[PDB]
Ligand binder design. Structure first.
Ligand SMILES: NC(=O)c1ccc[n+]([C@@H]2CC(COP(=O)(O)OP(=O)(O)OC[C@H]3O[C@@H](n4cnc5c(N)ncnc54)[C@H](O)[C@@H]3O)[C@@H](O)[C@H]2O)c1
Ligand SMILES: [Cl-]
Ligand SMILES: [Zn+2]
Lengths: 8, 291
């Protein structure tokens, strides 16, 4: 689903 | 509400191409992907910017760095910074921009397929955009939930605490006792299921249009530095025209430019003004603004 909210 | 161009250069010609694409494809719809840039004209204070009352209040409260206000671990250790930010940014404290109303206009003209937003101000919804056409990728204050057991809470309980002086005795779950917080996606948390599910459907929608009219995806006011939202642009079909209205070329538009990519360095409100003019909907637009 894209993973957790982050800057990476 | 008044706007002006970012530089001496005119963007009217580039904007005109967009209007031309729509004129040629009268039965096509547009998908918008937007960020904080479209709400700057609304006066929403940037928590990351010094010189903003919010930034300094958070600093005074010992917040280690801006984004710690959207960190679950920090929140659990000290919820005051987040409550303080909530008090200042709570929906209803601001009014939609000219660009937000442009979305409403497109909806009225039935040319709006969807608007994916990273903003938590919910100004798209406040402006009248229908729930079915909005994807609030980073959540909103419309719902509250216990970070421990997930019990649902009406948003009013949390909101009522924001009007107290000082803000204390934060909302705790009456089942497991953990902190209750607005359904805002914090860094480190997954986005709501509706995000990926809807993009899955709109992705198929985009591709099947390439083989019929020709859709259009417009990215506006985002630095495309926050994932997974930032992954959307690159996932747009190669054959679907991408438009970027941002003060700077960013993300995939910078890393992997496409021949048909149309970059428009312009303020979102000025962009909206110029697009309505080229589309010939000044009359209807003026009506919405005066509504
Ligand atoms: N209204 C809000 O919900 C809000 C407000 C402030 C910060 N944020 C943070 C922003 C954020 C997502 O990054 P994002 O959307 O990319 O923010 P961003 O602040 O990183 O970037 C906004 C981008 O838009 C550009 N920009 C600023 N004003 C305008 C304008 N008038 N017209 C056109 N372009 C403009 C600018 O070049 C910048 O790249 C999250 O991590 C939030 O926590 C959200
Ligand atoms: Cl492809
Ligand atoms: Zn609970």
């Amino acid at each position: 689903k894209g993973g957790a909210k982050r800057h990476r | 509400m008044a706007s002006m161009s970012v530089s001496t250069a005119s963007t009217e010609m580039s904007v005109r191409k967009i209007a031309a694409h729509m004129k040629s494809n009268p039965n096509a719809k547009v998908i918008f992907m937007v960020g904080a840039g479209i709400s700057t004209s609304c006066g929403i204070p940037d928590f990351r910017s010094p010189g903003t009352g919010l930034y300094h209040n958070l600093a005074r409260l010992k917040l280690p760095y801006p984004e710690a206000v959207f960190d679950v671990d920090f929140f659990q250790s000290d919820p005051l910074p987040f409550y303080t930010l909530a008090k200042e940014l709570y929906p209803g404290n601001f009014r939609p921009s000219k660009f937000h109303y442009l979305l409403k206009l497109f909806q009225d003209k039935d040319v709006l397929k969807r608007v994916y937003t990273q903003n938590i101000d919910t100004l798209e919804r406040q402006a009248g955009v229908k729930d079915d056409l909005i994807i609030e990728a980073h959540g909103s204050f419309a719902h509250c939930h216990c970070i421990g057991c997930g019990k649902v809470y009406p948003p009013q309980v949390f909101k009522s605490k924001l009007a107290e002086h000082p803000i204390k005795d934060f909302v705790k779950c009456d089942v497991c006792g953990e902190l209750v917080k607005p359904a805002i996606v914090f860094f480190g948390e997954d986005l709501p299921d509706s995000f990926s599910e809807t993009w899955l459907n709109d992705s198929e929608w985009l591709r099947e249009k390439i083989t019929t009219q020709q859709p259009l995806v417009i990215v506006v006011g985002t630095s495309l530095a926050v994932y997974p939202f930032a992954s959307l642009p690159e996932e747009i079909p190669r054959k679907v025209k991408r438009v970027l209205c941002n003060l700077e070329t960013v993300g995939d538009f910078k890393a992997n430019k496409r021949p048909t990519d149309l970059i428009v360095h312009q303020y979102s409100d000025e962009f909206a003004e110029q697009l309505v003019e080229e589309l010939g909907w000044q009359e209807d637009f003026e009506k919405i603004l005066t509504a």
